[PDB]
Write a protein that binds this DNA or RNA. Structure first.
Ligand SMILES: [Zn+2]
Ligand SMILES: [Zn+2]
Ligand SMILES: [Zn+2]
Length: 85
DNA sequence: AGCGTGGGCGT
DNA sequence: TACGCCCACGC
């Protein structure tokens, strides 16, 4: 973690330069991705793709046990667990 | 439950 | 650099 955040309030260190650049955004308020539908702005590309799903209702991940659908895999993961109890 | 959003990192 | 996953936390 040879990359440190120069913001005198922030404590963060990163392994690559791109992690730092990305991180900077929290400091600068830069939200480079706009949702085409609601115009809302987002700091990341991946976050934008997942948020759009809220508009379209697209759910690419289904539970293997019950077939319940989710917009995100993390949502799926959180859910499969319930089948243990 | 739904979903914003940061961190780690393969590529 | 940039993307796009996973993974996790928080409300
Ligand atoms: Zn910082
Ligand atoms: Zn939107
Ligand atoms: Zn299920």
């Amino acid at each position: 973690r040879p990359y440190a955040c120069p913001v005198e309030s922030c404590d963060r260190r990163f392994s690559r330069s791109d992690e730092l650049t990305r991180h900077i955004r929290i400091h600068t308020g830069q939200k480079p991705f706009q949702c085409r539908i609601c115009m809302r702005n987002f700091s990341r590309s991946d976050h934008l793709t997942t948020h759009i799903r809220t508009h379209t209702g697209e759910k690419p991940f289904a539970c293997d046990i019950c077939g319940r659908k989710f917009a995100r895999s993390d949502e799926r993961k959180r859910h499969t667990k319930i089948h243990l109890r």
